[PDB]
Design a protein around this ligand. Structure first.
Ligand SMILES: O=P(O)(O)O[C@@H]1[C@H](O)[C@H](O)[C@@H](OP(=O)(O)O)[C@H](OP(=O)(O)O)[C@H]1O
Ligand SMILES: O=P(O)(O)O[C@@H]1[C@H](O)[C@H](O)[C@@H](OP(=O)(O)O)[C@H](OP(=O)(O)O)[C@H]1O
Length: 326
């Protein structure tokens, strides 16, 4: 536990001033005893004391709310699942709400929290810093969040954003602010027609036979493919090229933020986050051309270096699309 804490004026909280007006913190907890969980009573007292009538709180946990009247009802909820991302629609809704609040008084602060004030919190903090003009790139904004939230004098565990889709989504915000005036790009609708996984050896059965793919849109399954069986698909394994190629059938029209989960019947293939071997998010409107290809570092779960004997340096997943217009 080397997150940068606030220990002044009779407070001891897991609370970081990323800037003078932008706070990152963990969940305001109740009935806790206690150590490194912030008691809601103390957090409430902190804001009422140090920023009277000049704070707004952002709760990023889809999983849990709390008594917002402890914060005089100045709480805004962004529903994001642990280890996942907001929809771009929700991210921009958040950005505008923070703008409305921050534009009204130079002394106003925002406090962004989640469960651990790490992944989800960093995603929105880094996006806000881009909006506010402090940084011109997602990489730098993310780097800065990491350096503020991590106290390296306490320990060497990084406390910034690490999961690949969260990094991609801050990247998406950069692209939006640089190319689309801060608003969503033109709607692009797509169908997945193919999936290709390179360096398949050592991953489950190492030939795709154990794998399945679920496409999720707006928190609902919209397609399931089971490879070996030919369930909504046709599998082809190439031993010499160390890759599997699967034709994807019956994919409905996809729009917006799409989560793709890969599941396995292999006991050998460990599960990371999201109760599966690997997954990723993308946005249909930010797809360029007829495909999206993701390297190991860009996929959720293979991003962790402990998996790097399983997912080797050339492990990639490519989705092929047809334009829902041709
Ligand atoms: O009822 P309380 O006192 O709030 O206890 C917490 C509650 O059960 C949460 O659902 C859980 O988080 P998750 O849902 O994310 O597991 C967390 O466990 P954890 O801290 O071990 O995750 C507990 O501390
Ligand atoms: O609530 P947030 O701000 O999203 O923060 C996440 C939360 O603290 C998770 O419990 C943690 O996973 P573990 O507890 O399993 O470490 C995750 O680590 P991650 O960044 O490695 O996903 C954090 O990002």
């Amino acid at each position: 536990q080397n997150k940068r804490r606030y220990r002044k004026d009779g407070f001891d909280l897991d609370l970081t001033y990323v800037t003078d007006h932008v706070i990152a913190m963990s969940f305001p907890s109740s009935g806790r005893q206690s150590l490194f969980r912030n008691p809601i009573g103390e957090v409430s007292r902190f804001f009422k004391t140090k920023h009277p009538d000049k704070f707004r709180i952002y709760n990023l946990c889809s999983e849990r709310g709390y008594d917002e009247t402890k914060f005089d009802n100045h709480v805004y909820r962004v529903m994001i699942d642990d280890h996942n991302v907001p929809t771009l629609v929700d991210l921009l809704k958040f950005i505008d709400d923070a703008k409305v609040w921050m534009t009204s008084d130079p002394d106003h602060v925002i406090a962004i929290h989640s469960k651990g004030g790490k992944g989800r919190t960093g995603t929105l903090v880094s996006s806000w810093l881009l909006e506010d003009g402090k940084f011109d790139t997602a990489k730098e904004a993310l780097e800065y969040f990491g350096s503020r939230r991590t106290d390296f004098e306490v320990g060497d565990v990084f406390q910034g954003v690490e999961t690949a889709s969260q990094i991609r989504y801050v990247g998406y915000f950069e692209k939006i602010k640089k190319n689309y005036g801060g608003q969503l790009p033109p709607m692009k609708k797509l169908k997945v027609t193919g999936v290709t996984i390179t360096a398949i050896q050592g991953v489950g059965r190492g030939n795709g036979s154990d794998l399945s793919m679920q496409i999720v849109s707006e928190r609902q399954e919209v397609l399931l493919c089971k490879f070996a069986e030919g369930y909504n698909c046709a599998l082809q394994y190439d031993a010499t090229d160390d890759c599997v190629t699967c034709e994807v059938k019956n994919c409905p029209v996809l729009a917006g933020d799409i989560k793709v989960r890969f599941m396995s019947t292999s006991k050998s293939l460990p599960r990371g986050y999201d109760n599966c071997p690997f997954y990723f998010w993308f946005n249909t409107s930010l797809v360029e051309g007829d495909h999206v290809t993701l390297k190991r570092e860009e996929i959720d779960n293979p991003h962790k270096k402990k998996t790097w004997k399983i997912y080797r340096d050339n492990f990639t997943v490519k989705l092929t699309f047809s334009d829902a217009e041709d």
